[PDB]
């Protein structure tokens, strides 16, 4: 059987992985493809965009979204601001209460111009406060459940939030610098990361944030972690042109 001899040509995934110059790509079914050297060079080209997930799957595209409950669409700010939504809510409640007979009575004797919402409110929303939403650049196809995770890949340590500070016990605002969080405390106590560490903690492995305070009460920097010989735990826990665009509008 001839398909079966080409099937003996159907090399090993290790055959591929070792042959190829860029081995990240090589996947499962890659090998049953009539031209895997091409297929892999393509998939390893720049800027190209891989097939969706879901050609394998037996379930169709978002029949997996089937299960859940979902909250209605959330307007743009600059359209809420102009206060349309409340007009429409009010009209809704009115006409859900009114009864059939009164409905037809209003059909025959209309409440002409019940409401108003003036222009320049609209025209200023759409022409004076309209703003760029959040867009995703070339390549990042949406697949099922992708929104299931709001955002990521900020491995940075300094990244703090204000609700984070509040519900962790630390300060929000201009004091997010001079506030070493409750995790920098044990950073100073027993350290950062064993094999990660490429993060320095502010006031624990970094210097004083602007106008920090040394002391051992609540609200200070404490003992910047140092050896018995004086060298800090790492780094320095104590602390020791013309970018104008050419074509731009007035």
């Amino acid at each position: 059987s001839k398909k079966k001899l080409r099937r003996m040509n159907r090399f090993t995934v290790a055959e591929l992985k070792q042959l190829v110059a860029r081995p990240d790509v090589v996947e499962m079914h890659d090998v049953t493809a009539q031209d895997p050297k091409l297929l892999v060079h393509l998939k390893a080209t720049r800027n190209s965009v891989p097939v969706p997930r879901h050609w394998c799957f037996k379930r169709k595209y978002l029949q997996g979204k089937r299960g859940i409950e979902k909250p209605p669409f959330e307007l743009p700010d600059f359209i809420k601001r102009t206060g349309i939504q409340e007009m429409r809510e009010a009209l809704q409640e009115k006409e859900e209460q009114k009864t059939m007979k009164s409905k037809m009575r209003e059909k025959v004797r209309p409440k002409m111009g019940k409401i108003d919402i003036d222009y320049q409110k609209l025209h200023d929303a759409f022409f004076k406060w309209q703003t760029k939403p959040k867009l995703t650049i070339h390549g990042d196809l949406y697949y099922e459940g992708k929104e299931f995770e709001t955002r990521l890949k900020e491995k940075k340590p300094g990244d703090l939030s204000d609700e984070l500070r509040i519900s962790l016990g630390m300060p929000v605002g201009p004091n997010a610098h001079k506030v070493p969080p409750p995790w920098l405390i044990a950073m100073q106590r027993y350290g950062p990361p064993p094999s990660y560490p490429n993060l320095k903690i502010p006031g624990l492995n970094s210097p004083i944030p602007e106008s920090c305070s040394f002391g051992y009460h609540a609200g200070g920097w404490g003992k910047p972690p140092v050896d018995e010989t004086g060298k800090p735990l790492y780094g320095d826990v104590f602390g020791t042109i013309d970018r104008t665009p050419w074509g731009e509008l007035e």
């Binding site: 940075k156 409750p182 995790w183 350290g191 990361p193 094999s195 051992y216």
Partner: protein
């Protein structure tokens, strides 16, 4: 690698949990796989920092981070510099807190003299917590905890 997120706070979201995991080291997994009914946090979670010493020091650091048959324990030499939710979470590592720590502070000012009492879940819970923190490292004035007196 695997760390028990104990006194796992209800609304303290797994997103900022993983952001603190990163702000400490290898944020590889932050998970509190909860009750199949509730959705809120289930008191103990798995936080994987893919480096063992990373998770070790991250744990030493993110401990104390501020996330009726006599099951009340007296806790003195008390740190006056704490908040309610943070103190409750610290006490709750070994049990529930059926009364947040009532700090016996003077009323003239609003600054404490260093004592409190806390209704935990169990008397063995007050035992274990008061044992691990008998004389041990409190915020500024070292802890001293045991079974509480009755007033």
């Amino acid at each position: 690698a695997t760390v028990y997120v104990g006194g796992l706070d209800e609304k303290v979201s797994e997103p900022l949990l993983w952001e603190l995991f990163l702000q400490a080291g290898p944020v590889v997994n932050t998970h509190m796989p909860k009750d199949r009914v509730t959705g809120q946090h289930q008191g103990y979670g798995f936080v994987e920092f893919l480096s063992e010493e990373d998770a070790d020091y991250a744990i030493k650091i993110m401990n104390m981070i501020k996330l009726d048959v006599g099951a009340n324990i007296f806790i003195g030499n008390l740190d006056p510099e704490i908040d309610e939710k943070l103190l409750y979470d610290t006490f709750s590592a070994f049990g529930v807190i059926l009364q947040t720590p009532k700090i016996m502070r003077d009323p003239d000012t609003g600054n404490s003299k260093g004592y409190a009492f806390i209704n935990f879940a169990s008397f063995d819970a007050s035992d274990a917590a008061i044992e691990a923190m008998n004389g041990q490292y409190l915020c500024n004035r070292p802890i001293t905890v045991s079974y509480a007196f009755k007033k």
